[PDB]
Amino acid sequence: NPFDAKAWRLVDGFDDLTDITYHRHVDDATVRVAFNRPEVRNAFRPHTVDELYRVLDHARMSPDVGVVLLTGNGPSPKDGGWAFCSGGDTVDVARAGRLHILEVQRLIRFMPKVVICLVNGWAAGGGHSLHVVCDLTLASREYARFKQTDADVGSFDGGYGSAYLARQVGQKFAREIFFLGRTYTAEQMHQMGAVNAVAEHAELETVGLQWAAEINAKSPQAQRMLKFAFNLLDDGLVGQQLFAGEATRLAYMTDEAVEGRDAFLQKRPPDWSPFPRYF
Amino acid sequence: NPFDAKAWRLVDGFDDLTDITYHRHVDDATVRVAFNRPEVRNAFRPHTVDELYRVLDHARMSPDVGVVLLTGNGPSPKDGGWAFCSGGDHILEVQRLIRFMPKVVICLVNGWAAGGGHSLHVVCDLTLASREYARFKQTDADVGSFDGGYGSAYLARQVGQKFAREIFFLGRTYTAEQMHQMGAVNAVAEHAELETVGLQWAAEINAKSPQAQRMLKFAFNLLDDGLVGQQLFAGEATRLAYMTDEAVEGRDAFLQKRPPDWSPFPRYF
Amino acid sequence: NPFDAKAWRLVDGFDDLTDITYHRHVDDATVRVAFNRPEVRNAFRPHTVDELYRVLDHARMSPDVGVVLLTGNGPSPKDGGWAFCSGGDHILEVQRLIRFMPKVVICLVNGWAAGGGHSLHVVCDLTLASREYARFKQTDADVGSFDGGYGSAYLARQVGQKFAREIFFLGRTYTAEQMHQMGAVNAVAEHAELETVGLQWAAEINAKSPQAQRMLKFAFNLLDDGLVGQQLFAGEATRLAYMTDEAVEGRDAFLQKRPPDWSPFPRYF
Amino acid sequence: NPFDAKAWRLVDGFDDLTDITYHRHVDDATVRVAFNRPEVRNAFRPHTVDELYRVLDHARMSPDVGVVLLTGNGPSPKDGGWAFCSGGDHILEVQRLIRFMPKVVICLVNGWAAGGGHSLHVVCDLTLASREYARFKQTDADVGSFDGGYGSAYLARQVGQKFAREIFFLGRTYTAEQMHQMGAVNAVAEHAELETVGLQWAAEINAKSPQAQRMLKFAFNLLDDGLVGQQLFAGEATRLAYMTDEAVEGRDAFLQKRPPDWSPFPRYF
Amino acid sequence: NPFDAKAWRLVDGFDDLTDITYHRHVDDATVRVAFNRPEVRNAFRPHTVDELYRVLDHARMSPDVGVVLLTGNGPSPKDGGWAFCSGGDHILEVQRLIRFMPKVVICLVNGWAAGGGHSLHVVCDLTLASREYARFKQTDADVGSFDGGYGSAYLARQVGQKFAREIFFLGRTYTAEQMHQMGAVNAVAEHAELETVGLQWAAEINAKSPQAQRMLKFAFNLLDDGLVGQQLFAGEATRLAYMTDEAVEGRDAFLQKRPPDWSPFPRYF
Amino acid sequence: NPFDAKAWRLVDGFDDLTDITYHRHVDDATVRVAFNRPEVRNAFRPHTVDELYRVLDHARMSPDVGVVLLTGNGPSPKDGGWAFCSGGDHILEVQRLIRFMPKVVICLVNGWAAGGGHSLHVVCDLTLASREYARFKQTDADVGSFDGGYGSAYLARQVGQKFAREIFFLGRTYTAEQMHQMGAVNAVAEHAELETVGLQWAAEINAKSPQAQRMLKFAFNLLDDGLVGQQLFAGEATRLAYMTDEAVEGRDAFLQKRPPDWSPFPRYF
């Protein structure tokens, strides 16, 4: 099993979770968020999505977490098979039909932390789309299976799952993945450019933690700017908003800005003299 | 006073609000969300942002609400002045909430709209402004701050690049009529009638197909917001497909385990 | 020879074709569109482009066709050589017809794909290539020409900016396997099996929801094609909307001269 | 009446048009394409769109025509009303034809421009409007429809995002002067002089270098149209390159079976 | 005459300028760069462009200069006419220099702004125009040239796509006030007061945080300028981060060959 | 040692160079520009960047130079090891000069390419790498730095978003062959043959039409670089136009004080 209990501690306040598990590493600034319905191939129901959203939002707001590992628990009790995520499982009509998984994609995209998907088995439909939006993907050599099946049922992910996949594997390969909906292995998707590295199944989370540790070893501020720099143009004004918001925060810390805030409350004319027009 | 108390009821469940008020119209599919710190020119402190986010997010999830009027309460009990929102005393999360919600948000600028408050007006779908009292000022750079996101770059998609750069670089105060001429204010209203007019705009939006309005909003956001724009618009497109006979057939043929039959459905061109 | 005559039937109405052949599969929603000048390495002349347009335009409007296989006939009777298309002896219009048609176009590169013929493979949705015989060469710059549109800039969205630049600046010849490594060729097939593989690909495409397939192609085009990409994708959203109960009510309330009742139709979020 | 019968001749080969008229100016490089269903406020049925496409495509390919005036015939014989085009009774193909044609297309809005007809005016390069009778109205969402393409997103590139949102979300009627203030109408003309003014603007356009006007149109389309926009502009650049002595040297050498001498042609910067 | 000799001193090191003048205000962090060929309507020859480049580059690299005033000297000694710049008697390099310099460049259009002269005004951050004498004309296409770059596409980001296309396609002469209405001119000033107003605008820009103004300009440029816009904005961000405690530590560790300690620096969200 | 002394001559007028070397090839239109501080792993100090900018700008202005080979001298005289460029001990200006120059720049990564040195390789048009000694490592975030421009966002347009994020966030060291597989290195060469191979690629580039190569490089930049990319590409197209009969006519007419006759020049479609 990829899961090594000795590396993980439950996060306080999440005793009520049924469809997701959430652990913090014993030492490292890393959390493990996982689908916890292996008996149904880790398909998500609206309750799952609510919990996933809650847990990732909590991880986003934890100042002592730099890396989220997103994965699926397993294996299945009914068949021994392995799944990361196999996709989706008048007032209330509206609130039922929530596009909640889309809100979860944006939370992954926008959070100032590196999210690594660890693909431990089937990554199908909305599950495949979740792997696509994560910053990095590591995959199980033996059991990772990628398959974009949406169009078999007349559905499609016309957003991050398709258009952003073309910015990883190129337009020819991403069209093939969607138009034919074939099943690919970890090594096939690594060769195309959507999986970063392939790991032995039992060592997938071990590799995920080495990756997280190398990320957490660098300047957190730099890692934040880099993720938003990578999102920026592809995300248009939203991209610029997140990236400029981090630049605004940086500026606030400077002597110049401290001068400027001084002046306003003190009530005098700000003094820009000390601060050159850099070029 | 633009506020007509008789028109509005408090939304249940928000008795602990201190910095924001939140009403639903007595008859219309319209809510009124307002800054409630008039003695401090409606500046937001972190608690105000928490509350604003909570109220708008509830508004977003209210299936019977079509339009959000976002405004400030007044006048100031200190100097009798008028403020929509004077900026900072999390606000990016609220900007994205306004931008992504599948409902039209109209800012009713009833007074000063400065700094962060000016940026909030810019990211709203529509803006109506008090002729007498709306004042637009982007002051950020006085204290060495800047909104380098929707407050500036998106403003330039309203008034064009020369006017947007003037607004930020000089930090002058602008009237409702000035901003209407430049293209950032949709209309000017008599101060006392600002909310009456807002309600009339809301009623006109609410009279059209809600499906179509939601699609148009995301269509206007789409390219400017890149893949996020695409994600929201395509998301609604996925919803529309879900409803079709084709997707029904697709879902049925999956469970009654069999090959789907697409022969009844053209390859439209 | 990749061509299996038993799988194909001539399309009615095209007896006069001289430079292109056009067949429909005996069973599948697939057509075969081929350069028919192997004596001249399948170079296109003006009349060739005209015919290729009419044929692809017909394929676009055929509601029982989901996939186009685009290839070159062969071998050359002069020298036994193999060519998909070697470029010009109007082609921009044919690129846009491939790009915008609501069906998956697969290029089967059975031989040289050079200059213009290289750019046609690039703009196709997918490419399969003959292991033994496909030869990819962008020679535009030798003769002072350039495809500064889809053949270059879109190629960079398949193989990345370093490779696409190499391909054009140096004009070297690449095998199917090389172009597969780089990302411009989806798969390599044995020469004799290229069309058999293309048909298996086409069958897998046509076994899915045609609606979802059309939506996905326009989703992949969207942002890269700017307002044109949004026009095609949103044009399909409009079509989906028209089918809904909401629009039906919208439309009837207009005809019956009453105010629309949107009340049964929730404000989705 | 804006139409001056003496100024125009029927274009040859269109004796079978019923829903559109197509004239060429007596002296100028200018055509007049007009909706011809005034009894029905110039709404388009599928046959109208077929004809409109055929006509505009013929004008695109007419090398002696520089400018298309696109307008609406009237008045209505039923009530005396004036209509440019009131929208739907393929139109996306017409929009790309106007967008992509290497000629300036001026919309002369002589009356109502509603729904799809409003979107046609938006996609034209320039719009002149009848002071007295132009009415701009974007009604789509009333019937649960929407133009999520050029008619909305591209309108926002003319009047800015706040006004474009306003126009669609409320569906109010606007006068020529209002749209001229907002930046969607270039100029307002006396009703009776609309075509006269149109022809004067056409003549000023036709007096300049046609190759330059072509490049400038494609320059204005380019970045908004993503890869399509790049394809059309680069396509014109390719054409310019083909004319150069450098290009000649490369073409000569190819057929002359020798290696080219780039010696004469310097390395610009 | 808008030039006030008493306000300006020559910049040291520039005695050899013949085609441009370059002054620094006696008191303010503002420079005056101006075309100095009034006898030929301030048309630029290659030597003019060399000098213009050298001067603006100097201004860019002058840390005590916050704002550049770019204008035209006059009147003409021949006819008493007034010209900002009438264009081409390398300019793309100057355009980029204006565009990328981390300082506000205000164009003061005191006279004719035609051809490349019009395009320079368009690329400046802000434009102030002489009420009586500013004339804006885009003439390129008369002689078969075009600015398909900032002069045309970026103008559409100020005035909208309809007005920008009119401006180029007809090549009419516009007044200061017409350009102001359309959105390409920020403000109109009495001719004699043009440089006084420009100094006042400069002083209001120079009164705010220079770092905020730098960032804002690159935020305005960013998405329009793609990866270049990103490069400039992110480069400023990189400069900010270098100053922080966190970066100081990172730097310490490397040089001291020890492992950095990030614990003091929180994961901001 | 990749450097073949017999192949290269010093360029006149750069005798004062300390941190960079500059050679022109004895026969070919290719220059060699190289970091010359192998004792400090070719790290650049500000003086190095000044010299690099100056040399590259000279090459950009040399009309008899088509290709720039950008590399690092060595080995280190202290430890026998090899570096292309280890980054910092102005560099954004150098990245832009490489990006915007109308010549192909090939980085020859003959050793460590780290930090700013890695980002220089990334912005080059092509990269060839030493099998045995090339080591690519993006170390920025180790000391709290980042290239948020071309070094990161443009790397993603070569190797794709997953790979670029890995390269930055983990900062691992990669080989030539690993980077070739990812898409950022065009080809791998035996170490002592790196420049021999670089010269062969240069010769293949220099044997095509220099005008086509220039337009190609700007086509590849265009959309990614927004309005800057359009400015550059449109700039070339304006040059092409200046050459035509139509533009010669427009010029003559204006000189001869007569109307232009555009009569002989068709409206191409």
Tab-separated table of C-alpha atoms in Angstrom, chain B residues 29 60-67 102-103 206-212 214-215 218-220 222-223 226-228 230 233-234 236-241 243-247 260 262 265-269, chain C residues 29 60-67 102-103 206-212 214-215 218-220 222-223 226-227 230 233-234 236-247 260 262 265-269:
chain	number	residue	atom	x	y	z
B	29	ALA	CA	-35.519	38.672	-6.905
B	60	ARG	CA	-24.625	33.580	-5.101
B	61	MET	CA	-26.249	30.383	-3.687
B	62	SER	CA	-29.762	31.835	-3.408
B	63	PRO	CA	-31.690	30.334	-6.334
B	64	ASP	CA	-34.505	32.880	-6.028
B	65	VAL	CA	-32.157	35.901	-6.270
B	66	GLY	CA	-31.229	37.136	-9.680
B	67	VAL	CA	-29.481	40.479	-9.046
B	102	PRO	CA	-23.721	33.622	-12.160
B	103	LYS	CA	-25.742	36.747	-11.302
B	206	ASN	CA	-34.790	39.671	-13.879
B	207	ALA	CA	-37.500	39.776	-16.580
B	208	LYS	CA	-35.266	38.012	-19.084
B	209	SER	CA	-34.289	34.325	-19.204
B	210	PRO	CA	-31.995	33.620	-16.201
B	211	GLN	CA	-30.221	30.923	-18.208
B	212	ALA	CA	-29.410	33.438	-20.995
B	214	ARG	CA	-25.838	33.719	-16.808
B	215	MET	CA	-24.423	32.624	-20.207
B	218	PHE	CA	-19.655	34.414	-18.604
B	219	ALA	CA	-19.426	35.247	-22.351
B	220	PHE	CA	-18.412	38.782	-21.475
B	222	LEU	CA	-14.551	34.668	-21.067
B	223	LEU	CA	-11.522	35.760	-23.099
B	226	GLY	CA	-8.475	33.167	-20.045
B	227	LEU	CA	-8.762	29.578	-18.889
B	228	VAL	CA	-10.853	30.653	-15.872
B	230	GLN	CA	-13.374	29.373	-20.331
B	233	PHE	CA	-18.589	29.483	-19.651
B	234	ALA	CA	-17.868	25.843	-20.615
B	236	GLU	CA	-22.595	26.253	-18.104
B	237	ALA	CA	-22.352	24.711	-21.539
B	238	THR	CA	-21.832	21.276	-19.854
B	239	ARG	CA	-24.952	21.917	-17.800
B	240	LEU	CA	-26.977	22.700	-20.935
B	241	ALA	CA	-25.743	19.500	-22.613
B	243	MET	CA	-30.341	18.288	-20.177
B	244	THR	CA	-30.412	17.083	-23.814
B	245	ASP	CA	-31.973	13.840	-25.151
B	246	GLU	CA	-28.511	13.016	-26.428
B	247	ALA	CA	-26.944	13.090	-22.922
B	260	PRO	CA	-25.226	4.108	-26.920
B	262	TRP	CA	-26.610	8.244	-31.445
B	265	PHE	CA	-29.027	12.908	-33.230
B	266	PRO	CA	-27.667	14.981	-36.159
B	267	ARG	CA	-24.131	16.177	-36.616
B	268	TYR	CA	-25.213	19.822	-36.572
B	269	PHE	CA	-22.942	22.238	-38.392
C	29	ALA	CA	-19.543	7.873	-40.369
C	60	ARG	CA	-18.609	19.592	-43.211
C	61	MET	CA	-22.332	19.802	-44.222
C	62	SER	CA	-22.916	16.033	-44.206
C	63	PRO	CA	-24.862	15.253	-41.043
C	64	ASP	CA	-24.033	11.562	-41.219
C	65	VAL	CA	-20.216	12.086	-41.275
C	66	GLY	CA	-18.270	12.451	-37.951
C	67	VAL	CA	-14.640	12.048	-39.100
C	102	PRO	CA	-17.492	20.543	-36.229
C	103	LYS	CA	-15.849	17.160	-36.868
C	206	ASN	CA	-17.753	8.134	-33.801
C	207	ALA	CA	-18.767	5.824	-31.003
C	208	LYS	CA	-19.029	8.780	-28.535
C	209	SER	CA	-21.632	11.535	-28.284
C	210	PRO	CA	-21.386	13.634	-31.471
C	211	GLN	CA	-22.582	16.643	-29.409
C	212	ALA	CA	-19.806	16.209	-26.831
C	214	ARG	CA	-18.247	18.988	-31.415
C	215	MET	CA	-18.160	20.845	-28.068
C	218	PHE	CA	-14.354	24.019	-30.129
C	219	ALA	CA	-13.176	23.923	-26.492
C	220	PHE	CA	-9.663	22.950	-27.730
C	222	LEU	CA	-11.299	28.367	-28.205
C	223	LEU	CA	-8.621	30.506	-26.532
C	226	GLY	CA	-9.577	34.272	-29.714
C	227	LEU	CA	-12.957	35.850	-30.626
C	230	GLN	CA	-15.345	31.959	-28.654
C	233	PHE	CA	-17.910	27.487	-29.009
C	234	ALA	CA	-20.582	29.980	-27.874
C	236	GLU	CA	-22.768	25.645	-29.994
C	237	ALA	CA	-23.853	26.761	-26.445
C	238	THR	CA	-26.621	28.867	-28.086
C	239	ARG	CA	-27.745	25.765	-29.980
C	240	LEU	CA	-27.891	23.783	-26.745
C	241	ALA	CA	-29.818	26.594	-25.030
C	242	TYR	CA	-32.421	26.705	-27.824
C	243	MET	CA	-33.342	23.089	-27.025
C	244	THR	CA	-34.135	23.763	-23.347
C	245	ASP	CA	-37.525	24.128	-21.684
C	246	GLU	CA	-36.527	27.636	-20.621
C	247	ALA	CA	-35.946	28.792	-24.210
C	260	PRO	CA	-42.475	34.994	-19.979
C	262	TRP	CA	-39.285	31.936	-15.749
C	265	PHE	CA	-36.480	27.551	-14.094
C	266	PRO	CA	-33.969	27.942	-11.273
C	267	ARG	CA	-30.946	30.220	-11.064
C	268	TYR	CA	-28.212	27.610	-11.245
C	269	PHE	CA	-24.862	28.206	-9.602
